[PDB]
Each structure stands twice: as C-alpha cells, then as structure tokens.
Design an enzyme around this catalytic site. Sequence first.
Site: not given
Ligand SMILES: NC(=O)c1ccc[n+]([C@@H]2O[C@H](COP(=O)([O-])OP(=O)(O)OC[C@H]3O[C@@H](n4cnc5c(N)ncnc54)[C@H](OP(=O)(O)O)[C@@H]3O)[C@@H](O)[C@H]2O)c1
Length: 416
Positions: A102, A142
């Site tokens: 991480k 991430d």
């Molecule tokens: N193992 C790995 O490699 C790993 C680990 C962690 C994450 N990831 C991926 O990488 C990304 C990083 O996380 P992140 O937090 O940057 O993504 P994220 O914030 O989850 O991407 C969109 C999120 O924001 C919210 N959202 C969508 N449209 C919006 C708007 N117009 N206004 C306000 N909020 C809105 C959504 O919530 P609602 O669904 O409630 O609308 C959704 O959960 C994630 O998407 C995940 O899939 C990968």
Amino acid sequence: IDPFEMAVKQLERAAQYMDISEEALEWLKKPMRIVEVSVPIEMDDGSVKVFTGFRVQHNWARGPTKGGIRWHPAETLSTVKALATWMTWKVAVVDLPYGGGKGGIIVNPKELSEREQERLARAYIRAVYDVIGPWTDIPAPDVYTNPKIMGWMMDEYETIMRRKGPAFGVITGKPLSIGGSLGRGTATAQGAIFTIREAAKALGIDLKGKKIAVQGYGNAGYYTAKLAKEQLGMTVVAVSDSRGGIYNPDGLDPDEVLKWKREHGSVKDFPGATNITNEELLELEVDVLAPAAIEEVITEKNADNIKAKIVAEVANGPVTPEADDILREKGILQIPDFLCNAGGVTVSYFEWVQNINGYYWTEEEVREKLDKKMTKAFWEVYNTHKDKNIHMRDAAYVVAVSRVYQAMKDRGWVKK
Ligand SMILES: NC(=O)c1ccc[n+]([C@@H]2O[C@H](COP(=O)([O-])OP(=O)(O)OC[C@H]3O[C@@H](n4cnc5c(N)ncnc54)[C@H](OP(=O)(O)O)[C@@H]3O)[C@@H](O)[C@H]2O)c1
C-alpha cells in the site's frame, strides 16, 4: 492505531477457524517493511512544500507486493498499514504471485495543479525507489489517483532506473497508450459479475432476466449494472446515488441512467422510476444485491430485512460482522468484499504480466483469464465454506491466510 488493530483483530478471528502457528500470527500482524519518507515539491508559487509519504509492504512471501496509492489529507500510517494487510489477503484469495502493499501521501489533491500533481508523483517515486520495483513492489492507482499520475510515476521510475529493466512493469493502471492493459476500467465490475454468476450456479439459480439491485451508482456500480444486464441478461431494478435511489420493476437501462445522472447531477426523478431511499433499496425483493457505496451500508438494523439470496459486496467491507452473521443465519449467500472487488487487482496483475513479457493481450484474452482466475478463487472459497461450515468472509480469510502461511513455510520464514 484503529484501522491497523482492526485488521489485526480480523486476522485473529480468521485464524480462529484454521490451524496456523502462533509465530505465524505474530509475523503476519507486523508488516515487513514500513517506509515513511518526506516528499518535497516546488510549489507553483515558488515555495517548496514537503508532504509525508508511506509505503507499507505487509508481506512478500507469495511474490512481489502489490498496492494502491492514495492521496487523501486524512491518510495515516495505520490506515496504510491496514490496507496493505487487507491487500495481502486480497491478492492471496485470487492465488496471484503477489504480496500485500500500500502507498499513500498526506495531501489534498483538489488544490494541486497538474504540474504540482506531476511533481508530487515524480518526487514520491524519487523517495520510494529504493523499496519498489517490478519484482519488489508494484504501486497501483487508488482513490484520488488516476492513470495520469500512474504515467508520471512510471516515467519517473524509468528515468531513474535508466531503462535497465521492465519499467512498464513497476506499476499498474497505466494508460493504454503506454504499458496499458484492456479491461482495467471495468475490472472490478467484471470480477463482481463473474462472482455473481458463479454464486448463482452454486445455489442452483439461473439468472435469466431476474432482479439485481445495486446500491451506489459510481463508476464501479454503473459498470456492474451494465455488465450484469449485458452478460447475465438480468433485470436491473434499482440504482441509487448519494442523493436518492430509483426503482422500476420492469427494468432499467444503465446507459440512460448514467446519462441522466451526468446531465442532471443525480439519478433522482428518473422517468418511469419511483424515488426511494437507500435503506428501502437495500430491502428490496431481489435475487442479487450489490452495495457499491459508502461502507457500513448494512447494519443490524436492516440486516434482518435483507431478502436478496445473493449479496455481492463490491464495496470494501460495507457489511458489519454482526450483519454478516445475520445474513448467514438467514440462508443468504454473501460474497465477501475482497472476493468481489478482486477483479481490479486481477487485471492489474494481468497488466503487470503483459508489461514484463512485452506482449499485450486483447480484450477477450484478458476477460478469459480474469474469468478463469476469479471463478477458481470463488469456487475455492465456496468449497471451504461447505467444508468448514464457516462464513464466506471466514472461508475467504482462511484460504488467503493458508496460502500466505504455506508460502512463508516454503520460504523458511517460519519453521513450524
Ligand atoms: N484495489 C484497487 O486497486 C482499488 C482500491 C480502491 C478503489 N479502487 C477503485 O479506484 C477508485 C478510487 O476511489 P474514488 O473514491 O476516487 O472513486 P469514487 O469517488 O467512488 O468514484 C465515484 C464516487 O463518487 C460518487 N459520485 C458520483 N457522481 C457524483 C457527483 N456528481 N457528485 C458527487 N459525488 C458523486 C459516487 O457515489 P454514489 O455511488 O453514492 O453516487 C461514487 O461512489 C474507485 O472508483 C475504485 O473503484 C481500486
């Protein structure tokens, strides 16, 4: 502190259902390598600002460590350590030659300009070069990181190493133009859909045109819904954003729902769909339930009201252990968190393999390999479930810890 000790408690509870030595528990509790560095960057105003970066390699018995990089102002050493410890079992359940890693930087990227973000990524690589590498530690995108930061980091690593080895293989999530791999965007959703299909097969349920309900309509949620409706042909009946949810018993089209959300800022008041609350969406009479939003979405208050036979928690730990027990005693098959979102790390591993070998696979090839790996992992977990009579989460934890213990014993790290 809190998250690290929570991960330690989870590891203890997992080991309660399997036979491994005490020295193995102590070795697994303490991450092998912690690297806290100062990342200096020349700010756009001319000043030089220093941030605190963490790189935690929890274990590398099974192979080079793998881990995402987070740029969040609330990031702490304990959070990074706990996430690396979780990533260990995340890569172990899929049976990958990976350890747990991480990365993180204490920074808020909202006010950082593109030049500032590039400088931050390059300086972070300059600081953490000595403990990373294609065969040592693979960073990944991430939360609050996108493939552009990955491209910058890979460029910096390649510049420092003088292009001696497989630079593209040092990290994953890179853009398709430079060392990229197909299926990266829909990786987590594709793995989730494979697990859903496999759980349906295990329970004897055919998913032809049935109900799937997704709580959370982010990128992962939208991809999961679209992939379900396309491959499995299921009827998407409910999707919810941070504001509200929309329900329609006849079905939904994820494409038009995403278009409406982008145009209006939310999915609220969608045509042909009644507006419902997130808790009401969680309690719908569906067959597949997938929470794709803020964690601890299901608790003891609403766990007893869940009627969906298959619960594939794509989110990271969105269900409490008490709610896990409640779902277990209700005859509900619940796919664990790292047994659901493992598609992203599986396709990252595929990208790493492509980068080393110098050969890049097509979309169908990556999809086939992801299907094989993910189905094998889920089937191993389900077999351990039916054997040890322990929860899905418990079975996946047992499988991952058993694999890590076997790798450590083979390396001679632990004698017993
Ligand atoms: N193992 C790995 O490699 C790993 C680990 C962690 C994450 N990831 C991926 O990488 C990304 C990083 O996380 P992140 O937090 O940057 O993504 P994220 O914030 O989850 O991407 C969109 C999120 O924001 C919210 N959202 C969508 N449209 C919006 C708007 N117009 N206004 C306000 N909020 C809105 C959504 O919530 P609602 O669904 O409630 O609308 C959704 O959960 C994630 O998407 C995940 O899939 C990968």
